[PDB]
Amino acid sequence: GSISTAVIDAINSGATLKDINAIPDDMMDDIYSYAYDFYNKGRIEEAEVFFRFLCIYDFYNVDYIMGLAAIYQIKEQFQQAADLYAVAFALGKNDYTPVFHTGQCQLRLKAPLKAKECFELVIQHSNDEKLKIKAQSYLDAI
Amino acid sequence: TLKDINAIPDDMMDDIYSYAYDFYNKGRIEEAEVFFRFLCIYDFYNVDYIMGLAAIYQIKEQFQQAADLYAVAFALGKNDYTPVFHTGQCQLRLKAPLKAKECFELVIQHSNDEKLKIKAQSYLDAIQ
Ligand SMILES: NC1=NC(=O)c2cc(Cl)ccc21
Ligand SMILES: [Cl-]
Ligand SMILES: [Cl-]
Ligand SMILES: [Mg+2]
Ligand SMILES: [Mg+2]
């Protein structure tokens, strides 16, 4: 998947498509907009292809990662979702939304201690008061 | 992948990893790089294999290449902020001090590794 592609690219250290500016920013923006068009209409499989395409071209992009992670979470591919959410967090640093969703994923993976660690991070560090309430509700059930 | 089918016994992979760090510790960077690339081809999902290849790229002053692998390494481990610390070092070398500050601050705010936080704070103290 997307993470494997990123690691293979890093191993090979040959020229990538982004290295030669093969697809301009405005064009990537358009494709991202089509990806969400598909997603918003329930065409999840088509959206997944488009987000995978975007992540092959520019893996280290929070918006593309988050779109793909959401698809995996909806498809109950919870480990794949959690891994991508953590990449998004590492790149973005100040949005705890990916940490919250990783906590949801860890609960479904039967890892409540990992989920508790996620939800506690949201409470301790997020300034999103509504997200903190949501995180607390999961903590209350654990 | 090769790991998915147990293509090489576990103890032999342990040996190859230990030989890779032996090369690294002895300054045989080109040979360490072959061995860490081999390991990451065998199992891209192994955080310590990725960290070893990232260390090679950092020592070779391929700082963005290292930082990219550190972001994957962070995700695979979820709660180990060592890759975030090293990303902070790479960002300083890339002349991105605000990004580096964000990395070191993330280590101090989330890590439970006291020795790592001490190191991260020493970098924050030096950043203008
Ligand atoms: N420190 C952390 N423990 C976790 O389980 C986790 C998940 C994510 Cl997404 C970011 C950071 C962390
Ligand atoms: Cl993958
Ligand atoms: Cl999965
Ligand atoms: Mg490259
Ligand atoms: Mg607060």
PDB file of C-alpha atoms and ligand atoms in Angstrom:
ATOM      1  CA  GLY A   1       0.000   0.000   0.000  1.00  0.00           C
ATOM      2  CA  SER A   2       0.886   3.669   0.399  1.00  0.00           C
ATOM      3  CA  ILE A   3       3.432   3.136   3.175  1.00  0.00           C
ATOM      4  CA  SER A   4       5.182   0.308   1.310  1.00  0.00           C
ATOM      5  CA  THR A   5       5.431   2.568  -1.751  1.00  0.00           C
ATOM      6  CA  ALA A   6       7.017   5.333   0.332  1.00  0.00           C
ATOM      7  CA  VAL A   7       9.568   2.930   1.814  1.00  0.00           C
ATOM      8  CA  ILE A   8      10.480   1.372  -1.543  1.00  0.00           C
ATOM      9  CA  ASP A   9      10.940   4.884  -2.961  1.00  0.00           C
ATOM     10  CA  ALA A  10      13.234   5.703  -0.044  1.00  0.00           C
ATOM     11  CA  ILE A  11      15.261   2.499  -0.464  1.00  0.00           C
ATOM     12  CA  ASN A  12      15.771   2.979  -4.189  1.00  0.00           C
ATOM     13  CA  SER A  13      16.624   6.706  -3.935  1.00  0.00           C
ATOM     14  CA  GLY A  14      16.087   7.005  -7.678  1.00  0.00           C
ATOM     15  CA  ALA A  15      14.243   9.884  -9.267  1.00  0.00           C
ATOM     16  CA  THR A  16      10.549  10.035  -8.432  1.00  0.00           C
ATOM     17  CA  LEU A  17       7.694  11.662 -10.301  1.00  0.00           C
ATOM     18  CA  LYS A  18       7.593  14.514  -7.793  1.00  0.00           C
ATOM     19  CA  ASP A  19      11.379  15.012  -8.119  1.00  0.00           C
ATOM     20  CA  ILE A  20      10.820  16.187 -11.711  1.00  0.00           C
ATOM     21  CA  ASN A  21       7.626  18.165 -10.939  1.00  0.00           C
ATOM     22  CA  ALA A  22       5.689  15.795 -13.174  1.00  0.00           C
ATOM     23  CA  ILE A  23       2.263  16.984 -11.952  1.00  0.00           C
ATOM     24  CA  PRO A  24       1.759  20.695 -11.100  1.00  0.00           C
ATOM     25  CA  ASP A  25       0.192  21.893  -7.854  1.00  0.00           C
ATOM     26  CA  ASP A  26      -3.011  23.143  -9.495  1.00  0.00           C
ATOM     27  CA  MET A  27      -3.447  19.738 -11.151  1.00  0.00           C
ATOM     28  CA  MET A  28      -2.913  17.919  -7.851  1.00  0.00           C
ATOM     29  CA  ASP A  29      -5.482  20.241  -6.245  1.00  0.00           C
ATOM     30  CA  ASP A  30      -7.996  19.284  -8.952  1.00  0.00           C
ATOM     31  CA  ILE A  31      -7.416  15.548  -8.480  1.00  0.00           C
ATOM     32  CA  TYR A  32      -7.813  15.958  -4.726  1.00  0.00           C
ATOM     33  CA  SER A  33     -11.136  17.697  -5.390  1.00  0.00           C
ATOM     34  CA  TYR A  34     -12.280  14.821  -7.615  1.00  0.00           C
ATOM     35  CA  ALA A  35     -11.229  12.324  -4.963  1.00  0.00           C
ATOM     36  CA  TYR A  36     -13.507  13.973  -2.418  1.00  0.00           C
ATOM     37  CA  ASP A  37     -16.283  14.295  -5.018  1.00  0.00           C
ATOM     38  CA  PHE A  38     -16.221  10.502  -5.358  1.00  0.00           C
ATOM     39  CA  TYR A  39     -15.949  10.059  -1.590  1.00  0.00           C
ATOM     40  CA  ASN A  40     -18.821  12.453  -0.825  1.00  0.00           C
ATOM     41  CA  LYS A  41     -21.073  10.523  -3.234  1.00  0.00           C
ATOM     42  CA  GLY A  42     -20.277   7.144  -1.647  1.00  0.00           C
ATOM     43  CA  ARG A  43     -17.971   6.038  -4.484  1.00  0.00           C
ATOM     44  CA  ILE A  44     -15.391   4.942  -1.931  1.00  0.00           C
ATOM     45  CA  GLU A  45     -13.489   2.583  -4.222  1.00  0.00           C
ATOM     46  CA  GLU A  46     -12.904   5.294  -6.818  1.00  0.00           C
ATOM     47  CA  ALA A  47     -11.961   7.761  -4.067  1.00  0.00           C
ATOM     48  CA  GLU A  48      -9.463   5.256  -2.676  1.00  0.00           C
ATOM     49  CA  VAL A  49      -7.747   4.931  -6.060  1.00  0.00           C
ATOM     50  CA  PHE A  50      -7.531   8.720  -6.378  1.00  0.00           C
ATOM     51  CA  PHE A  51      -6.098   9.137  -2.868  1.00  0.00           C
ATOM     52  CA  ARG A  52      -3.629   6.299  -3.535  1.00  0.00           C
ATOM     53  CA  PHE A  53      -2.639   8.102  -6.744  1.00  0.00           C
ATOM     54  CA  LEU A  54      -2.115  11.336  -4.817  1.00  0.00           C
ATOM     55  CA  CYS A  55      -0.085   9.501  -2.171  1.00  0.00           C
ATOM     56  CA  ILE A  56       2.151   7.863  -4.785  1.00  0.00           C
ATOM     57  CA  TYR A  57       2.926  11.300  -6.200  1.00  0.00           C
ATOM     58  CA  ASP A  58       3.236  13.154  -2.873  1.00  0.00           C
ATOM     59  CA  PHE A  59       3.070  10.755   0.083  1.00  0.00           C
ATOM     60  CA  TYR A  60       4.233  13.284   2.682  1.00  0.00           C
ATOM     61  CA  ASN A  61       1.101  15.413   2.460  1.00  0.00           C
ATOM     62  CA  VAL A  62      -1.235  15.616   5.456  1.00  0.00           C
ATOM     63  CA  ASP A  63      -4.373  16.207   3.387  1.00  0.00           C
ATOM     64  CA  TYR A  64      -3.798  13.181   1.135  1.00  0.00           C
ATOM     65  CA  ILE A  65      -2.853  10.908   4.028  1.00  0.00           C
ATOM     66  CA  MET A  66      -5.919  11.927   6.039  1.00  0.00           C
ATOM     67  CA  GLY A  67      -8.250  11.261   3.118  1.00  0.00           C
ATOM     68  CA  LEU A  68      -6.871   7.760   2.659  1.00  0.00           C
ATOM     69  CA  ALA A  69      -6.873   7.014   6.393  1.00  0.00           C
ATOM     70  CA  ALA A  70     -10.549   7.941   6.592  1.00  0.00           C
ATOM     71  CA  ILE A  71     -11.356   5.464   3.809  1.00  0.00           C
ATOM     72  CA  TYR A  72      -9.523   2.644   5.591  1.00  0.00           C
ATOM     73  CA  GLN A  73     -11.309   3.436   8.841  1.00  0.00           C
ATOM     74  CA  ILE A  74     -14.697   3.311   7.118  1.00  0.00           C
ATOM     75  CA  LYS A  75     -13.713  -0.002   5.517  1.00  0.00           C
ATOM     76  CA  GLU A  76     -12.730  -1.375   8.961  1.00  0.00           C
ATOM     77  CA  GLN A  77      -9.093  -1.681   7.868  1.00  0.00           C
ATOM     78  CA  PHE A  78      -8.202  -0.285  11.240  1.00  0.00           C
ATOM     79  CA  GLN A  79      -4.457  -0.977  11.423  1.00  0.00           C
ATOM     80  CA  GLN A  80      -3.891   0.592   8.000  1.00  0.00           C
ATOM     81  CA  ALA A  81      -5.908   3.619   9.104  1.00  0.00           C
ATOM     82  CA  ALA A  82      -4.009   3.995  12.387  1.00  0.00           C
ATOM     83  CA  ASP A  83      -0.639   3.803  10.638  1.00  0.00           C
ATOM     84  CA  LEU A  84      -1.589   6.568   8.187  1.00  0.00           C
ATOM     85  CA  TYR A  85      -3.101   8.721  10.931  1.00  0.00           C
ATOM     86  CA  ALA A  86       0.227   8.538  12.768  1.00  0.00           C
ATOM     87  CA  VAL A  87       2.112   9.669   9.637  1.00  0.00           C
ATOM     88  CA  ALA A  88      -0.290  12.603   9.350  1.00  0.00           C
ATOM     89  CA  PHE A  89       0.286  13.523  12.988  1.00  0.00           C
ATOM     90  CA  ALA A  90       4.072  13.398  12.605  1.00  0.00           C
ATOM     91  CA  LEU A  91       3.866  15.724   9.603  1.00  0.00           C
ATOM     92  CA  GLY A  92       1.226  18.117  11.024  1.00  0.00           C
ATOM     93  CA  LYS A  93       2.056  18.043  14.771  1.00  0.00           C
ATOM     94  CA  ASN A  94      -0.621  20.482  16.012  1.00  0.00           C
ATOM     95  CA  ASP A  95      -3.906  18.810  14.987  1.00  0.00           C
ATOM     96  CA  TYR A  96      -4.968  16.050  17.375  1.00  0.00           C
ATOM     97  CA  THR A  97      -7.770  14.804  15.098  1.00  0.00           C
ATOM     98  CA  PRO A  98      -5.540  11.986  13.725  1.00  0.00           C
ATOM     99  CA  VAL A  99      -4.699  10.986  17.302  1.00  0.00           C
ATOM    100  CA  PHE A 100      -8.400  10.802  18.201  1.00  0.00           C
ATOM    101  CA  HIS A 101      -9.199   8.612  15.203  1.00  0.00           C
ATOM    102  CA  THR A 102      -6.219   6.359  15.935  1.00  0.00           C
ATOM    103  CA  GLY A 103      -7.738   5.858  19.380  1.00  0.00           C
ATOM    104  CA  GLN A 104     -10.985   4.745  17.756  1.00  0.00           C
ATOM    105  CA  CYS A 105      -9.015   2.341  15.559  1.00  0.00           C
ATOM    106  CA  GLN A 106      -7.076   0.916  18.505  1.00  0.00           C
ATOM    107  CA  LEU A 107     -10.319   0.197  20.355  1.00  0.00           C
ATOM    108  CA  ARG A 108     -11.522  -1.841  17.377  1.00  0.00           C
ATOM    109  CA  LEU A 109      -8.136  -3.593  17.272  1.00  0.00           C
ATOM    110  CA  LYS A 110      -8.720  -4.688  20.908  1.00  0.00           C
ATOM    111  CA  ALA A 111      -5.825  -2.533  22.169  1.00  0.00           C
ATOM    112  CA  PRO A 112      -7.563  -0.428  24.848  1.00  0.00           C
ATOM    113  CA  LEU A 113      -4.295   0.693  26.464  1.00  0.00           C
ATOM    114  CA  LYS A 114      -3.105   2.110  23.144  1.00  0.00           C
ATOM    115  CA  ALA A 115      -6.524   3.708  22.674  1.00  0.00           C
ATOM    116  CA  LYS A 116      -6.356   5.214  26.183  1.00  0.00           C
ATOM    117  CA  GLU A 117      -2.923   6.652  25.388  1.00  0.00           C
ATOM    118  CA  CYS A 118      -4.372   8.313  22.270  1.00  0.00           C
ATOM    119  CA  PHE A 119      -7.429   9.759  24.005  1.00  0.00           C
ATOM    120  CA  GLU A 120      -5.359  11.045  26.933  1.00  0.00           C
ATOM    121  CA  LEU A 121      -3.045  12.846  24.510  1.00  0.00           C
ATOM    122  CA  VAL A 122      -6.045  14.647  23.007  1.00  0.00           C
ATOM    123  CA  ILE A 123      -7.257  15.762  26.443  1.00  0.00           C
ATOM    124  CA  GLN A 124      -3.818  16.921  27.576  1.00  0.00           C
ATOM    125  CA  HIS A 125      -2.719  18.737  24.416  1.00  0.00           C
ATOM    126  CA  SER A 126      -5.632  19.581  22.087  1.00  0.00           C
ATOM    127  CA  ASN A 127      -7.239  23.019  22.126  1.00  0.00           C
ATOM    128  CA  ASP A 128     -10.276  21.649  20.253  1.00  0.00           C
ATOM    129  CA  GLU A 129     -12.836  21.586  23.074  1.00  0.00           C
ATOM    130  CA  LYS A 130     -15.406  19.501  21.174  1.00  0.00           C
ATOM    131  CA  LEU A 131     -12.758  16.924  20.238  1.00  0.00           C
ATOM    132  CA  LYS A 132     -11.741  16.709  23.899  1.00  0.00           C
ATOM    133  CA  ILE A 133     -15.349  15.889  24.881  1.00  0.00           C
ATOM    134  CA  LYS A 134     -15.442  13.127  22.276  1.00  0.00           C
ATOM    135  CA  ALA A 135     -12.120  11.745  23.504  1.00  0.00           C
ATOM    136  CA  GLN A 136     -13.345  11.849  27.102  1.00  0.00           C
ATOM    137  CA  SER A 137     -16.459   9.846  26.202  1.00  0.00           C
ATOM    138  CA  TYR A 138     -14.272   7.005  24.939  1.00  0.00           C
ATOM    139  CA  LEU A 139     -12.064   7.231  28.039  1.00  0.00           C
ATOM    140  CA  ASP A 140     -15.196   7.005  30.208  1.00  0.00           C
ATOM    141  CA  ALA A 141     -16.082   3.659  28.604  1.00  0.00           C
ATOM    142  CA  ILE A 142     -12.606   2.088  28.824  1.00  0.00           C
TER     143      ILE A 142
ATOM    144  CA  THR B   1       6.837  -9.503   1.053  1.00  0.00           C
ATOM    145  CA  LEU B   2       9.759 -11.785   1.901  1.00  0.00           C
ATOM    146  CA  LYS B   3       8.915 -11.338   5.586  1.00  0.00           C
ATOM    147  CA  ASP B   4       5.297 -12.364   4.955  1.00  0.00           C
ATOM    148  CA  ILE B   5       6.441 -15.840   3.858  1.00  0.00           C
ATOM    149  CA  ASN B   6       9.230 -16.333   6.464  1.00  0.00           C
ATOM    150  CA  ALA B   7      11.759 -16.489   3.637  1.00  0.00           C
ATOM    151  CA  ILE B   8      14.788 -16.213   5.993  1.00  0.00           C
ATOM    152  CA  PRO B   9      14.793 -17.641   9.545  1.00  0.00           C
ATOM    153  CA  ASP B  10      14.341 -15.216  12.433  1.00  0.00           C
ATOM    154  CA  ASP B  11      17.793 -15.728  13.964  1.00  0.00           C
ATOM    155  CA  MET B  12      19.458 -15.143  10.591  1.00  0.00           C
ATOM    156  CA  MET B  13      17.616 -11.838  10.209  1.00  0.00           C
ATOM    157  CA  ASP B  14      18.741 -10.905  13.741  1.00  0.00           C
ATOM    158  CA  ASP B  15      22.291 -11.690  12.666  1.00  0.00           C
ATOM    159  CA  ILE B  16      22.038  -9.530   9.529  1.00  0.00           C
ATOM    160  CA  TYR B  17      20.685  -6.617  11.569  1.00  0.00           C
ATOM    161  CA  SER B  18      23.553  -6.961  14.055  1.00  0.00           C
ATOM    162  CA  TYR B  19      26.059  -7.137  11.181  1.00  0.00           C
ATOM    163  CA  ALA B  20      24.498  -3.990   9.700  1.00  0.00           C
ATOM    164  CA  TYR B  21      25.110  -2.059  12.922  1.00  0.00           C
ATOM    165  CA  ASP B  22      28.620  -3.526  13.173  1.00  0.00           C
ATOM    166  CA  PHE B  23      29.364  -2.006   9.753  1.00  0.00           C
ATOM    167  CA  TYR B  24      27.821   1.295  10.861  1.00  0.00           C
ATOM    168  CA  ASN B  25      29.754   1.433  14.151  1.00  0.00           C
ATOM    169  CA  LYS B  26      33.001   0.732  12.248  1.00  0.00           C
ATOM    170  CA  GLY B  27      32.406   3.522   9.737  1.00  0.00           C
ATOM    171  CA  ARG B  28      31.765   1.134   6.834  1.00  0.00           C
ATOM    172  CA  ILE B  29      28.815   3.222   5.739  1.00  0.00           C
ATOM    173  CA  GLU B  30      28.510   1.901   2.197  1.00  0.00           C
ATOM    174  CA  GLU B  31      28.287  -1.698   3.473  1.00  0.00           C
ATOM    175  CA  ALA B  32      25.892  -0.732   6.281  1.00  0.00           C
ATOM    176  CA  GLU B  33      23.717   0.953   3.651  1.00  0.00           C
ATOM    177  CA  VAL B  34      23.541  -2.238   1.542  1.00  0.00           C
ATOM    178  CA  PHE B  35      22.637  -4.252   4.650  1.00  0.00           C
ATOM    179  CA  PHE B  36      19.989  -1.811   5.889  1.00  0.00           C
ATOM    180  CA  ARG B  37      18.486  -1.552   2.405  1.00  0.00           C
ATOM    181  CA  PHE B  38      18.396  -5.356   2.313  1.00  0.00           C
ATOM    182  CA  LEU B  39      16.589  -5.429   5.665  1.00  0.00           C
ATOM    183  CA  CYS B  40      14.016  -2.833   4.584  1.00  0.00           C
ATOM    184  CA  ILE B  41      13.364  -4.735   1.353  1.00  0.00           C
ATOM    185  CA  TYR B  42      12.813  -7.865   3.428  1.00  0.00           C
ATOM    186  CA  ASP B  43      10.419  -6.155   5.892  1.00  0.00           C
ATOM    187  CA  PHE B  44       9.446  -2.531   5.201  1.00  0.00           C
ATOM    188  CA  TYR B  45       7.187  -2.655   8.281  1.00  0.00           C
ATOM    189  CA  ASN B  46      10.002  -3.153  10.843  1.00  0.00           C
ATOM    190  CA  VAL B  47      10.578   0.133  12.666  1.00  0.00           C
ATOM    191  CA  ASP B  48      14.160  -0.684  13.675  1.00  0.00           C
ATOM    192  CA  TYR B  49      15.102  -1.641  10.125  1.00  0.00           C
ATOM    193  CA  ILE B  50      13.702   1.680   8.875  1.00  0.00           C
ATOM    194  CA  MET B  51      15.493   3.603  11.655  1.00  0.00           C
ATOM    195  CA  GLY B  52      18.785   2.011  10.630  1.00  0.00           C
ATOM    196  CA  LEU B  53      18.406   3.060   7.016  1.00  0.00           C
ATOM    197  CA  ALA B  54      17.328   6.531   8.127  1.00  0.00           C
ATOM    198  CA  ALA B  55      20.481   6.800  10.244  1.00  0.00           C
ATOM    199  CA  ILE B  56      22.578   5.925   7.180  1.00  0.00           C
ATOM    200  CA  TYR B  57      20.901   8.656   5.139  1.00  0.00           C
ATOM    201  CA  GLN B  58      21.360  11.180   7.947  1.00  0.00           C
ATOM    202  CA  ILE B  59      25.065  10.402   8.301  1.00  0.00           C
ATOM    203  CA  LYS B  60      25.405  10.747   4.519  1.00  0.00           C
ATOM    204  CA  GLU B  61      23.830  14.240   4.771  1.00  0.00           C
ATOM    205  CA  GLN B  62      20.751  13.135   2.843  1.00  0.00           C
ATOM    206  CA  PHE B  63      18.635  14.946   5.395  1.00  0.00           C
ATOM    207  CA  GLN B  64      15.243  15.098   3.664  1.00  0.00           C
ATOM    208  CA  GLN B  65      15.595  11.439   2.679  1.00  0.00           C
ATOM    209  CA  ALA B  66      16.296  10.609   6.324  1.00  0.00           C
ATOM    210  CA  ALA B  67      13.403  12.773   7.556  1.00  0.00           C
ATOM    211  CA  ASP B  68      10.999  10.980   5.211  1.00  0.00           C
ATOM    212  CA  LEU B  69      11.912   7.577   6.659  1.00  0.00           C
ATOM    213  CA  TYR B  70      11.727   8.995  10.187  1.00  0.00           C
ATOM    214  CA  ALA B  71       8.100   9.988   9.561  1.00  0.00           C
ATOM    215  CA  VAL B  72       7.289   6.427   8.498  1.00  0.00           C
ATOM    216  CA  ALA B  73       9.263   5.078  11.479  1.00  0.00           C
ATOM    217  CA  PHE B  74       7.277   7.257  13.864  1.00  0.00           C
ATOM    218  CA  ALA B  75       3.998   5.924  12.514  1.00  0.00           C
ATOM    219  CA  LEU B  76       5.081   2.308  12.785  1.00  0.00           C
ATOM    220  CA  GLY B  77       6.013   2.694  16.472  1.00  0.00           C
ATOM    221  CA  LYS B  78       3.295   5.288  17.350  1.00  0.00           C
ATOM    222  CA  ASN B  79       4.753   6.246  20.760  1.00  0.00           C
ATOM    223  CA  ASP B  80       8.543   6.368  20.224  1.00  0.00           C
ATOM    224  CA  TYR B  81       9.615   9.964  19.652  1.00  0.00           C
ATOM    225  CA  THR B  82      13.243   9.110  18.794  1.00  0.00           C
ATOM    226  CA  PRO B  83      12.524   9.505  15.028  1.00  0.00           C
ATOM    227  CA  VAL B  84      10.940  12.902  15.749  1.00  0.00           C
ATOM    228  CA  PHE B  85      14.097  13.975  17.607  1.00  0.00           C
ATOM    229  CA  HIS B  86      16.303  12.984  14.674  1.00  0.00           C
ATOM    230  CA  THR B  87      13.919  14.724  12.250  1.00  0.00           C
ATOM    231  CA  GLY B  88      14.504  17.886  14.283  1.00  0.00           C
ATOM    232  CA  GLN B  89      18.240  17.497  13.663  1.00  0.00           C
ATOM    233  CA  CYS B  90      17.665  16.968   9.932  1.00  0.00           C
ATOM    234  CA  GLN B  91      15.447  20.034   9.710  1.00  0.00           C
ATOM    235  CA  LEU B  92      18.136  22.193  11.301  1.00  0.00           C
ATOM    236  CA  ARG B  93      20.569  21.007   8.613  1.00  0.00           C
ATOM    237  CA  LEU B  94      17.967  21.781   5.932  1.00  0.00           C
ATOM    238  CA  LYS B  95      17.756  25.376   7.297  1.00  0.00           C
ATOM    239  CA  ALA B  96      14.149  24.904   8.496  1.00  0.00           C
ATOM    240  CA  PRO B  97      14.537  25.992  12.148  1.00  0.00           C
ATOM    241  CA  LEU B  98      10.823  26.494  12.809  1.00  0.00           C
ATOM    242  CA  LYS B  99      10.069  22.943  11.675  1.00  0.00           C
ATOM    243  CA  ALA B 100      12.957  21.720  13.815  1.00  0.00           C
ATOM    244  CA  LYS B 101      11.602  23.583  16.841  1.00  0.00           C
ATOM    245  CA  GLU B 102       8.220  21.909  16.279  1.00  0.00           C
ATOM    246  CA  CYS B 103       9.887  18.481  16.263  1.00  0.00           C
ATOM    247  CA  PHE B 104      11.838  19.068  19.481  1.00  0.00           C
ATOM    248  CA  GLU B 105       8.751  20.535  21.149  1.00  0.00           C
ATOM    249  CA  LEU B 106       6.746  17.457  20.189  1.00  0.00           C
ATOM    250  CA  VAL B 107       9.355  15.244  21.855  1.00  0.00           C
ATOM    251  CA  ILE B 108       9.198  17.252  25.090  1.00  0.00           C
ATOM    252  CA  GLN B 109       5.408  17.324  25.199  1.00  0.00           C
ATOM    253  CA  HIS B 110       4.693  13.643  24.414  1.00  0.00           C
ATOM    254  CA  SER B 111       7.748  11.459  25.056  1.00  0.00           C
ATOM    255  CA  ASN B 112       8.139   9.335  28.192  1.00  0.00           C
ATOM    256  CA  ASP B 113      11.859   8.902  27.384  1.00  0.00           C
ATOM    257  CA  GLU B 114      13.558  11.179  29.933  1.00  0.00           C
ATOM    258  CA  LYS B 115      17.028  11.017  28.379  1.00  0.00           C
ATOM    259  CA  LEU B 116      15.584  11.855  24.956  1.00  0.00           C
ATOM    260  CA  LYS B 117      13.669  14.830  26.366  1.00  0.00           C
ATOM    261  CA  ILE B 118      16.870  16.127  27.971  1.00  0.00           C
ATOM    262  CA  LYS B 119      18.543  15.990  24.534  1.00  0.00           C
ATOM    263  CA  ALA B 120      15.578  17.620  22.787  1.00  0.00           C
ATOM    264  CA  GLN B 121      15.545  20.448  25.339  1.00  0.00           C
ATOM    265  CA  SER B 122      19.244  21.090  24.732  1.00  0.00           C
ATOM    266  CA  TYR B 123      18.450  21.611  21.044  1.00  0.00           C
ATOM    267  CA  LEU B 124      15.508  23.908  21.805  1.00  0.00           C
ATOM    268  CA  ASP B 125      17.744  25.918  24.128  1.00  0.00           C
ATOM    269  CA  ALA B 126      20.204  26.503  21.238  1.00  0.00           C
ATOM    270  CA  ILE B 127      17.654  27.385  18.529  1.00  0.00           C
ATOM    271  CA  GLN B 128      17.341  31.139  18.106  1.00  0.00           C
TER     272      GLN B 128
HETATM  273  N1  LIG C   1       2.303   9.203  21.555  1.00  0.00           N
HETATM  274  C1  LIG C   1       1.374   8.484  20.904  1.00  0.00           C
HETATM  275  N2  LIG C   1       0.884   7.320  21.356  1.00  0.00           N
HETATM  276  C2  LIG C   1      -0.024   6.874  20.417  1.00  0.00           C
HETATM  277  O1  LIG C   1      -0.657   5.816  20.462  1.00  0.00           O
HETATM  278  C3  LIG C   1      -0.089   7.864  19.306  1.00  0.00           C
HETATM  279  C4  LIG C   1      -0.847   7.877  18.143  1.00  0.00           C
HETATM  280  C5  LIG C   1      -0.690   8.953  17.292  1.00  0.00           C
HETATM  281 CL1  LIG C   1      -1.657   9.033  15.852  1.00  0.00          CL
HETATM  282  C6  LIG C   1       0.187   9.986  17.571  1.00  0.00           C
HETATM  283  C7  LIG C   1       0.930   9.946  18.737  1.00  0.00           C
HETATM  284  C8  LIG C   1       0.778   8.866  19.602  1.00  0.00           C
HETATM  285 CL    CL C   2       1.390  -0.169   2.987  1.00  0.00          CL
HETATM  286 CL    CL C   3      -5.839  -2.890   8.147  1.00  0.00          CL
HETATM  287 MG    MG C   4      13.922  10.841  -3.007  1.00  0.00          MG
HETATM  288 MG    MG C   5      -5.616  22.301  27.406  1.00  0.00          MG
END
